[PDB]
């Protein structure tokens, strides 16, 4: 079906379902569905690229090695991941997924798994 990019917000910690549900509640409170940006995520072990639906304009690109955490929200449509934007600086990227966030969350976990193996292969 369809993914919507909800945007991103700073967060205080690199990990935690509490942190991502906090971020999702803030963003959900301050936007209406009409404002949500239709999009899709190009997932690779190196990077995730968030692309606008028709135009394919780049809305973000995130390196998988600095993704610290990801989760599905308490509402099953929600997906979020936390990026270590810097050593002590964390940014949460959030999505609404129809029919639910399962396939996208699992793709992004899979990128992290393959990227991690690369890190081990690099130093074997």
């Amino acid at each position: 079906f369809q993914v919507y990019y909800l945007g991103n917000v700073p967060v205080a910690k690199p990990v935690g379902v509490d942190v991502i549900n906090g971020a999702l509640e803030s963003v959900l409170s301050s936007s209406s569905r009409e404002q949500w940006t239709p999009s899709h995520v190009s997932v690779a072990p190196a990077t995730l690229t968030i692309l606008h639906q028709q135009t394919e304009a780049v809305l973000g690109e995130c390196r998988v090695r600095f993704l610290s955490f990801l989760a599905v929200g308490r509402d099953v449509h929600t997906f979020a991941f936390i990026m270590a934007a810097g050593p002590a600086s964390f940014c949460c990227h959030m999505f609404w997924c129809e029919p639910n966030a399962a396939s996208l969350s699992e793709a992004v976990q899979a990128a992290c798994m393959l990227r991690y193996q690369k890190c081990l292969d690099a130093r074997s």
């Binding site: 955490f69 990801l70 308490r74 990227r115």
Partner: peptide, 27 residues
Amino acid sequence: VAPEERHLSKMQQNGYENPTYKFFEQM
């Protein structure tokens, strides 16, 4: 418990810590 719902509940309850970041962090 469908195959979806098991992985799905874990994704909600626990999420997932990227071992790449945890690896590259220790060093």
